[PDB]
């Protein structure tokens, strides 16, 4: 059971960097995106 | 035994009274050198 | 000097605002906010262009307007304002009095911050210090100049066990053989993100023994700004470090919660968007945490020392946390609590088992201390560790295969965790915690003894029961 | 036991302070009585020359209507606009060109700046 | 006065230009006017959050911003009312709208059309400071004091005599041609402020022969208890509403279902006070907010349920906070959180959510208050975390800022034990600092007997693997009589019924004596053992009726049945030999 | 440049009996040795530049403990080398910049330590090049890409990080130097995952 539980909790951290990771890249875009038609002019 | 306090309120009193004789001599001249420095 | 306000604000959002014509500025500076109602905040210049500067506020924006809010500077470089009188007073996280006493006045101002040390300044911690307790003084000794933090879990006595380290710090120098002056010995007590029943707890705990008068004091609450948990430490080890560089003190400092200046930290880090890390903590949190803990150690040429003793909770236990985790890079060590020892009352509930001292081998010895320090470390270490393996293979196969090596070493064990390490609130000297070793280990016959060397065996194999 | 201690030492910590703070009251009086002296227009003008001097571009300087007339000689040669202020006593400050940065050169300013600096210095000389 | 129009509107979001001057958290008037919240300056554009639903709004709709941030109206007339999140009372708002809660609509937090009996307790010429007692206005049987507002000084000029008026009457006018009225305002996000916050050295008592022993809390602390389902969580709140020190009980709901907080609605005004014969909701101020209300309101409830609280105890009461559901209040706080863009910290919660909790928890405790008189707050907020799991991040950090944890279990309850507070999983930092307290009022032996108590039901919890593997007959003497102690323990002194006219309500004094009676016949039991007494003999003795029954013994005539009850414990092993 | 390389085929004595027999590393190879805190990389490695038949060691602090660094300034002149009569601290270099420095000087250190090690193989012996921590450079470079507001690739790391890793490790090996004479470059660097 501790192994098991040990695995569960190790993958959920994992899923959980990796959905920071994206949305990070989606605010990161977001931004880029409003600087670039915000210097267009 | 329990009375012990009364001389080292004493002390503080005096120590106090001394520290502000001590304090008084050089006040005008205090007064001046921070005002010199104060002022352009 | 002058005064120079600057009121073209453009832009205020969160914890941020822009100040468009503050080319003087200084990178990093601290500026003063003043609004309509001639409250007045707190600020930091975070980053300083020719179109704005980015300026963001210590406490909440609340109250602040494009029309009559302005800036003003107040100097280059965080100075703190330090004197020898500090001893015995009282002070939040941003250095203001709050015993009620009046302000101090400076001898010299110093930057928060401070600067590296000089790898070439340094020398080898190499003198011990008796915590009093019987696990830390004899199997993890503490040096001066180290760091050595404590990992505690949620309801572990973390406090108390900080609290006794600070009453029974001594350093004993009759030990040293030298015979020299006691030197002075003070303590820095840094405290973040505490509640009101730990500072009523800290405050009773240093009043009744006498204690604060040689301890300065500086207590973050939990409901306070948010910044202020970020300077405390800093402003605490630039005190301890002048004092112990410039009036040759030994200086303790213990910082009461490193989770809280954590969250701080993550929370100041979100607010200004930089990557994130592991678990959401910035990615600079490394280098963030090396500036407070490289601040200790020892110097050549000088007298004064630095130690640090910093106290954390690992979250659900968790070694592997990034707070753990990055706390032990940078540390010479660390004391581990134990849940375990906690259930079955022990106190302190220390397992020696993951604990380390890493500059033990440097201050333990003739002329240090007694010259079987390191000899009975070892050989409590080796059967200590016999013992829990005994006790792992009872609870499988059953008590019937022990042999009578097998259920001495395991009553040896039970002795132990009895004696040496459930010392209550027993201020144990290392003179007693040596006896109370030598008295449980004469419960193993001369033989099992190998790591110790046959001129100690005799000399203090006395074959004693303990006397307590 | 250590009560007696800090007993004394908080006895001894409240003089100080309060020798400290009626050294800086009567600072304070003593600034107070600055302009009845004869070299109040003269430090003055070297107060707003100062202020000037440290905000370059600066389009006016503002000051008290009854030191107005003392500055308006120094505001002819500085080549700026001048105006008066009641609120801005014992003090002058200058304008910049955008309007947005202000130079404040005021005497409790001045002695709100320094007297951090200036405590050490009265502390030795009042305690040797 | 500042003044916009809507420039660009998104969703909840409203961009309104020409509103220079405007400060950074001020409350807006939206539309013709939905009440919003500037949360960015930029130029002269302010952004707005609005609170209701922003469907049918247009660009060039006018935009005022009334000055101040989100406070709450403290003053006479909040007791015996209900509130929603931002202090609108439902009653009216029914009165004028009906069934629904119809948006734009605005009343008053105060009535402004009640008269109240003033009583002045100043004089012309008197200097006042803030704080002070001004006057005095009965209501509901209390003596509700006009307190001067902290940020106000000056002497008074003139003071109107005693008579009827309206809480926006100047009852008194300072010489500075400040009005002060009957009421005043504060910001909810700004903790009022103390003279000076006193240590916990007295108990705060509950009334459950459980919490008042094993897990005490002291006068201003803080606990937290968990919710599932099934445990009897709203009969233990109820209960101790009824038969606490407090003088005045604020109950926060902040989000929960709408049944739930139905229910909730319709039991408080059956209940009675113990004190009087009068219902207890007249010492009582209901804060209600359903799942489908605005999220700005459960997110403003506690801050305003808790500005009550330091209002009433800063008027010199003691008084008892309790938080329905802090898990809704993190879920809203998230949401606003997510309507930011703001990054999260973990399991999607902001990274200032333990700051937002300790700001909320740290506003208890027992202070000296402004006018020198002694007041505190005591706050007991629950959790109920999605799935019971506490390695949910809320309960994580709500675990590490209160002073008890009073754990709630379904398992006691299902087998008909109530409370059914498990004491395995519970703790209570609090007994060390109130231990002289219990000594100089309760017994020199108090604490002595609560371990001995402690200590037995440990033993008796760690046996529990045997018994269940074996049976209980299986054991020898001394395991029968510990598991037949901790029996008669869990029967007779932790388990309570609400219901009972007597049984509901327990003192000090009765719980230490029936704790020192369970020890001392269990030290008789041990003797009798120790002399050879078979354990059926022990087990059939007829005074475990008298223990038995002891709980149900009046307060006035427990001393009699306590000695009597002690002198047959000793008379029934002594003489039968 | 160097005229040619060379294959490895001499052992890199480290004086450890596990990783002498059981994962021996030859002359001019690369061997990496993660692991977590107090698992004893730092120890691993003062053991090998105490106990090499190295002509010249080169060890480089990049970002770790200056007690460690101190440690070597005072303990190393007074043992002896090995391979020849002296004190044992002329046969070292040290590249300190401990973590309270400059978190930009990390990269440089690395550089300066393998161009270094590369010069002295150019003369003609056989250095030995230590890694104290190469986890704190590439969080260096994380942090320069960061104020750059490059996209990151995976837990906030440049998408060039494995490229420079690359790059580093490739200079190792025996080879014929220019002067058409033999040396070698061993490299060990520590991961702190
Ligand atoms: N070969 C060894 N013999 C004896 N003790 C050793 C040995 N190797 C390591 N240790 C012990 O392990 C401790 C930790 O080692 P070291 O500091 O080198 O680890 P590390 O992996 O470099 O740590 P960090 O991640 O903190 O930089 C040493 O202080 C020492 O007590
Ligand atoms: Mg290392």
Known sequence: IPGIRAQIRFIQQVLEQREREDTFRLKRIKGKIEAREAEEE | ?40 | ?468 | ?128 | ?577
């Not at chain 3, 949190?285 to 110097?299: N, S, W």
């Open chain 5, 1 to 577: 006065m500042i003044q916009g129009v809507i420039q660009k509107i998104a969703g909840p979001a409203v961009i309104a230009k020409g509103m220079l001057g405007a400060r950074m958290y001020d409350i807006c008037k939206v539309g013709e006017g939905l009440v919003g919240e500037i949360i960015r300056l930029d130029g002269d554009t302010a952004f707005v959050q609005v609170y209701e639903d922003t469907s049918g709004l247009k660009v060039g709709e006018p935009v005022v911003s009334t000055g101040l941030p989100l406070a709450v109206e403290l003053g006479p007339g909040m007791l015996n009312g209900i509130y929603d999140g931002i202090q609108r009372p439902l009653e009216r708002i029914r009165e004028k709208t009906g069934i629904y809660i119809t948006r734009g609509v605005v009343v008053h937090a105060l009535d402004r059309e009640k008269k109240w009996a003033w009583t002045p307790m100043v004089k012309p010429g008197d200097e006042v400071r803030g704080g002070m007692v001004l006057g005095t206005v009965p209501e509901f049987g209390f003596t509700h004091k006009i307190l001067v507002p902290p940020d106000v000084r000056g002497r008074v000029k003139e003071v109107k005599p005693a008579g009827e008026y309206t809480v926006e009457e100047p009852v008194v006018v300072l010489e500075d041609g400040t009005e002060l009225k009957m009421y005043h305002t504060w910001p909810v996000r700004r903790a009022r402020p103390v003279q000076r916050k006193l240590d916990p050295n007295t108990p705060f008592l509950t009334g459950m022969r459980i919490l008042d022993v094993l897990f005490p809390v002291a006068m201003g602390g803080t606990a937290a208890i968990p919710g599932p389902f099934g445990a009897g969580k709203s009969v233990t709140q109820q209960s101790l509403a009824k038969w606490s020190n407090a003088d005045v009980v604020v109950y926060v709901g902040c989000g929960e279902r709408g049944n739930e907080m139905t229910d909730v609605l319709v039991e408080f005004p059956e209940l009675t006070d113990p004190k009087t014969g009068g219902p207890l909701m007249h010492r009582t101020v209901l804060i209600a907010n359903t799942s489908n209300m605005p999220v700005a309101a459960r997110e403003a409830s506690i801050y305003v349920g808790v500005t009550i609280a330091e209002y009433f105890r800063d008027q010199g009461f003691s008084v008892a906070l309790m938080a329905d559901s802090t898990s809704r209040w993190a879920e809203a706080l998230r949401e606003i959180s997510s309507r930011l863009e703001e990054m999260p910290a973990e399991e999607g919660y902001p990274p200032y959510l333990a700051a937002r909790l300790a700001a909320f928890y740290e506003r208890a405790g027992k202070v000296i208050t402004l006018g020198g008189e002694e007041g505190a707050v005591t706050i007991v907020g629950a959790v109920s975390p999605p799935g019971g799991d506490m390695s949910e991040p809320v309960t994580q950090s709500t675990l590490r800022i209160v002073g008890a944890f009073w754990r709630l279990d379904a398992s006691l309850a299902f087998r008909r034990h109530f409370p059914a507070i498990n004491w395995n999983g519970s703790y209570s930092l609090f007994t060390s600092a109130l231990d002289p307290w219990y000594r100089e009022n309760v017994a020199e032996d108090y604490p002595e007997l609560r371990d001995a108590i402690s200590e037995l039901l440990q033993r008796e919890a760690g046996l529990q693997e045997i018994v269940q593997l074996v049976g209980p007959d299986a054991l020898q003497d001394a395991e029968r009589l510990v598991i037949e102690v901790g029996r008669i323990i869990r029967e007779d002194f932790l388990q309570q019924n609400a219901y009972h006219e007597v049984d509901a309500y327990c003192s000090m004094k009765k719980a230490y004596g029936i704790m020192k009676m369970i020890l001392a016949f269990y030290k008789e039991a041990e003797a009798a053992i120790k002399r050879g007494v078979s354990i059926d003999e022990i087990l059939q003795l007829p005074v475990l009726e008298r223990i038995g029954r002891a709980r149900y013994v009046s307060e006035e005539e427990f001393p009699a049945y306590f000695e009597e009850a002690m002198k047959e414990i000793q008379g029934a092993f002594k003489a039968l030999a």
């Open chain 2, 1 to 40: 035994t329990e009375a012990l306090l009364a001389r080292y309120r004493e002390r503080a009193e005096a120590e106090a009274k001394a520290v502000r004789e001590k304090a008084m001599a050089r006040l005008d001249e205090a007064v001046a050198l921070v005002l010199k420095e104060v002022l352009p």
């Open chain 4, 1 to 128: 036991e250590s009560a007696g201690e800090l007993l004394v030492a908080t006895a001894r910590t409240q003089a100080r302070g309060e020798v400290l703070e009626e050294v800086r009251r009567r600072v304070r009086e003593a600034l107070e009585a600055l302009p009845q002296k004869p070299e109040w227009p003269e430090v003055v003008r070297k107060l707003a020359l100062e202020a000037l001097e440290a905000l370059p571009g600066a389009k006016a300087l503002v000051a008290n209507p009854e030191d107005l007339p003392h500055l308006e000689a120094l505001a002819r040669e500085r080549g700026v606009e001048l105006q008066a202020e009641p609120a801005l006593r014992l003090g002058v400050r200058a304008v910049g060109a955008e309007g947005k940065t202000q130079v404040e050169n005021s005497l409790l300013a001045r002695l709100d700046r320094a007297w951090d600096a200036l405590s050490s210095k009265v502390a030795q000389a009042l305690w040797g």
């Open chain 3, 1 to 468: 000097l002058l005064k120079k306000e600057y009121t073209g604000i453009t832009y205020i959002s969160g914890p941020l605002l822009f100040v468009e014509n503050a080319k003087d500025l200084a990178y990093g500076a601290i500026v003063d906010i003043k609004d309509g109602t001639g409250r007045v905040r707190g600020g930091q210049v975070i980053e300083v262009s020719e179109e704005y500067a980015v300026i963001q506020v210590f406490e909440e924006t609340t109250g602040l307007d494009l029309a009559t809010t302005s800036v003003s500077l107040v100097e280059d470089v965080a100075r703190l304002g330090v004197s020898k009188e500090m001893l015995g007073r009282r002070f939040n996280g941003i250095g203001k009095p709050i015993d009620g006493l009046p302000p101090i006045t400076p001898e010299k101002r110093l930057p928060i911050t401070g600067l590296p040390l000089n790898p070439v300044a340094r020398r080898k911690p190499e003198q011990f210090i008796q915590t009093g307790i019987s696990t830390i003084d004899v199997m993890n000794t503490l040096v001066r100049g180290q760091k050595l933090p404590i990992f505690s879990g949620s309801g572990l006595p973390a406090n108390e066990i900080a609290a006794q380290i600070a009453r029974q710090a001594t350093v004993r120098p009759d030990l040293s053989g030298e015979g020299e002056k006691e030197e002075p010995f003070a303590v820095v007590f840094a405290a973040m993100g505490i509640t009101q029943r730990e500072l009523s707890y800290f405050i009773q705990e240093f009043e009744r023994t006498g204690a604060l008068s040689r301890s300065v004091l500086f207590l973050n609450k939990a409901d306070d700004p948010t910044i202020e948990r970020i300077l405390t430490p800093r402003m605490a080890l630039t005190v301890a470090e002048y004092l112990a560089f410039e009036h040759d003190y030994h200086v303790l400092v213990i910082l009461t919660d490193m989770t809280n200046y954590c969250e701080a930290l993550r929370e100041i880090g979100a607010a200004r968007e930089e990557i994130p890390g592991r678990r959401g903590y910035p990615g600079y949190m490394y280098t963030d945490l090396a500036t407070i803990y490289e601040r200790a150690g020892v110097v050549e040429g000088k007298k004064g020392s630095v130690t640090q003793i910093p106290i954390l909770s690992m979250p659900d236990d968790d070694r592997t946390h990034p707070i753990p985790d990055l706390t032990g890079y940078i540390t010479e060590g660390q004391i581990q609590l134990s849940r375990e020892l906690h259930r079955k009352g022990i106190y302190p509930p220390i397992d020696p088992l993951p604990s380390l001292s890493r500059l033990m081998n440097n201050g333990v010895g003739k002329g240090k201390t007694r010259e079987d320090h390191k000899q009975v470390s070892d050989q409590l270490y080796s059967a200590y560790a016999n013992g829990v393996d005994i006790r792992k293979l009872v609870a499988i196969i059953g008590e019937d295969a022990l042999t009578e090596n097998d259920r001495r070493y395991l009553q040896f064990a039970d002795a132990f965790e009895r004696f040496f390490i459930n010392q209550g609130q027993q201020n144990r000297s290392i003179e007693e915690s040596l006896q109370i070793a030598w008295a449980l280990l004469s419960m193993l016959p001369q033989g099992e003894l190998k790591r110790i060397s046959k001129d100690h065996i005799g000399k203090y194999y006395g074959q004693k029961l303990e006397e307590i």
